[PDB]
Amino acid sequence: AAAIGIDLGTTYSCVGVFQHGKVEIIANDQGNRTTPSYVAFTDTERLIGDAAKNQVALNPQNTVFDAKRLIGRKFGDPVVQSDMKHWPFQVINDGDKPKVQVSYKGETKAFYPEEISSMVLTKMKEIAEAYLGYPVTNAVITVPAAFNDSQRQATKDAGVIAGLNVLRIINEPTAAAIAYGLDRTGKGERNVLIFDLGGGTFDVSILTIDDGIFEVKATAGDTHLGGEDFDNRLVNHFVEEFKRKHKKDISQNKRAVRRLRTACERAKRTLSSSTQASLEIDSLFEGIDFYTSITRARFEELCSDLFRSTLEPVEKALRDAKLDKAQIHDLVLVGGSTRIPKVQKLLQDFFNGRDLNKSINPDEAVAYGAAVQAAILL
Ligand SMILES: Nc1ncnc2c1ncn2[C@@H]1O[C@H](COP(=O)(O)OP(=O)(O)NP(=O)(O)O)[C@@H](O)[C@H]1O
Ligand SMILES: [Cl-]
Ligand SMILES: [Mg+2]
Ligand SMILES: [Mg+2]
């Protein structure tokens, strides 16, 4: 019975398994190789993953996301106090722990962040069991390098609630290095840079690996910079375009903005492999259809300042590690936003043409490495 690797991300999660000498990343029921970290509560059902994210515009008060931003924290944590201003669901205080309060089956209910994350993990466990044909009981689960003991405990709790024996909680940059086999070196220091740009967060880690032992030399980044911010630049662009073609400002209509946002996220993904993308939204605002298009070059202009901003944390990490650009042996791309061609060009140019490790889909590389480690531990 194989153990699984699970990357429990802020915006998406991913599961892999190592068997028959290789990793497979497991697609969900819809064929998607990652699954939104979303849970929705209705009058009759609990929805998780794609089904929950697909109805967010219809049920914003009872659709929970961003639980990783709360997990293991106190209610009075300044991070919790700040983040809650921007969520459409209610957060409450229960013994200085935060809980998310929703309507579910006609009653008011509240859940700890680890309970929300346990539902995401249950879905990832079910995705793996559908592929394998038998129940999964052991897993390695990943966390950010900055997580403290309480955040690590609550993540482990989420896994046990989901019915997994948690073999280990390991750092995301460590898992990404394992995916590329960077910890097999032997005697000799290797300096590795992990550049992780996800849906909601940006993390740079510099690791020194010596005889299979990992040392974090420096970390940098921005906890509120990710693909969602690129989506938002596209939304604002199309809001201005809809004003031109229809004389109407749709920005105060919550429904229309959320649906435009979903369409922008899809067009953005297309622009990673095509030079143009079409937007086709029926009945966007006031029954009016919105059909338009955008080029990859225009998208890069709209985000040029955000893309460029990722290089300053790299410079800072190198200064803190007391390393020059040329001393970094391997550059590893992690996170779905590193699939954007312009982001790859900026990092490669900054490193004066060095190779990028990107042969594993960047949004899957952490789960890939977690699955390898789970097999090693078993
Ligand atoms: N091909 C693609 N091109 C561009 N963006 C993409 C692509 N595929 C996925 N994304 C984006 O990548 C983001 C999700 O990355 P992912 O690494 O899966 O999230 P995560 O694991 O939750 N990381 P984080 O939110 O920072 O904790 C979303 O903004 C997606 O829209
Ligand atoms: Cl599914
Ligand atoms: Mg992830
Ligand atoms: Mg992160």
Side-chain angles (χ1 to χ4, degrees), residues 1-186 188-378:
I4 56 178
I6 303 167
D7 180 13
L8 177 57
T10 310
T11 65
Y12 286 82
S13 299
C14 179
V15 60
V17 59
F18 183 96
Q19 61 173 0
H20 302 125
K22 66 183 147 67
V23 173
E24 294 301 329
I25 299 298
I26 301 170
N28 70 17
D29 279 342
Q30 297 66 237
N32 295 313
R33 293 164 67 92
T34 63
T35 294
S37 303
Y38 277 63
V39 175
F41 300 88
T42 76
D43 288 334
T44 62
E45 292 183 281
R46 226 165 24 162
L47 305 175
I48 307 160
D50 279 325
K53 185 161 181 191
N54 292 342
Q55 58 80 84
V56 66
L58 310 174
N59 189 21
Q61 285 182 68
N62 307 307
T63 304
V64 185
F65 58 92
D66 271 2
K68 196 170 173 181
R69 292 187 187 276
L70 291 171
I71 197 167
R73 295 184 185 270
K74 276 80 202 121
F75 177 79
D77 191 322
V79 170
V80 173
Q81 297 288 309
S82 172
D83 285 340
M84 65 189 291
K85 300 192 202 187
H86 313 279
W87 289 323
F89 52 88
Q90 171 94 291
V91 181
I92 66 171
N93 178 13
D94 185 23
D96 205 16
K97 289 178 76 182
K99 294 186 90 174
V100 182
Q101 188 173 258
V102 293
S103 301
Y104 179 33
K105 300 187 176 176
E107 290 188 21
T108 300
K109 304 295 281 234
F111 298 93
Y112 290 107
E114 65 257 46
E115 292 179 304
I116 301 294
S117 297
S118 85
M119 299 168 191
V120 172
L121 292 169
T122 293
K123 167 63 81 167
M124 304 314 295
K125 178 196 198 292
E126 286 176 359
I127 289 163
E129 293 169 338
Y131 173 88
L132 294 174
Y134 56 80
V136 170
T137 62
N138 298 288
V140 167
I141 300 172
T142 58
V143 293
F147 265 22
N148 64 26
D149 289 350
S150 173
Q151 293 169 293
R152 294 173 191 263
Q153 179 71 243
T155 298
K156 177 183 171 164
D157 288 357
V160 172
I161 294 166
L164 302 163
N165 179 51
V166 181
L167 297 172
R168 195 167 282 169
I169 294 289
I170 70 168
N171 284 351
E172 290 155 21
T174 299
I178 290 167
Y180 285 101
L182 300 175
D183 62 329
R184 297 163 41 238
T185 292
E189 278 195 311
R190 213 218 281 248
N191 303 312
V192 178
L193 192 144
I194 314 297
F195 184 97
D196 180 2
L197 183 65
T201 73
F202 176 44
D203 303 289
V204 175
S205 313
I206 298 179
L207 303 184
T208 304
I209 309 171
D210 195 339
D211 201 0
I213 305 308
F214 289 82
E215 170 201 4
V216 183
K217 285 279 195 62
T219 56
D222 188 329
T223 60
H224 288 94
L225 172 62
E228 294 177 312
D229 295 297
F230 310 147
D231 301 347
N232 282 339
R233 293 292 181 87
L234 285 168
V235 170
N236 293 340
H237 170 71
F238 289 120
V239 169
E240 293 305 294
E241 181 169 313
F242 197 99
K243 292 173 180 178
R244 306 292 201 173
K245 294 169 53 180
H246 291 128
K247 220 197 66 173
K248 292 175 171 58
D249 185 339
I250 73 164
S251 73
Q252 294 306 307
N253 186 295
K254 290 179 162 297
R255 168 77 59 101
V257 173
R258 173 70 257 192
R259 291 220 298 149
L260 179 55
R261 173 166 299 145
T262 297
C264 290
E265 183 179 16
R266 185 52 234 174
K268 174 189 72 171
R269 290 182 191 230
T270 297
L271 297 176
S272 286
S273 41
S274 303
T275 51
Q276 219 190 12
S278 294
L279 280 88
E280 308 201 350
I281 309 174
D282 282 341
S283 194
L284 168 63
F285 173 85
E286 291 183 357
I288 298 180
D289 288 355
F290 193 54
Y291 287 71
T292 183
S293 69
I294 184 158
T295 71
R296 175 193 292 177
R298 186 74 185 107
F299 168 64
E300 299 171 348
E301 300 179 25
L302 288 170
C303 296
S304 63
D305 60 312
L306 297 175
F307 292 167
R308 217 186 313 286
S309 74
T310 63
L311 296 181
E312 197 282 338
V314 178
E315 289 176 282
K316 184 197 184 176
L318 287 164
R319 267 200 323 271
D320 289 353
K322 291 169 293 189
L323 297 176
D324 307 324
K325 289 174 186 193
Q327 288 177 276
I328 302 292
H329 190 286
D330 300 273
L331 303 167
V332 177
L333 296 190
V334 176
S337 301
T338 65
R339 298 175 67 156
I340 299 175
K342 190 59 150 187
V343 172
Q344 300 179 2
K345 185 182 183 301
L346 281 161
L347 184 60
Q348 181 157 65
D349 290 351
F350 179 87
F351 280 93
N352 300 318
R354 288 288 331 270
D355 280 1
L356 300 183
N357 291 31
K358 57 177 165 57
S359 51
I360 299 166
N361 276 342
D363 48 340
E364 303 171 9
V366 170
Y368 190 117
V372 172
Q373 186 66 14
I376 290 169
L377 292 180
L378 207 62

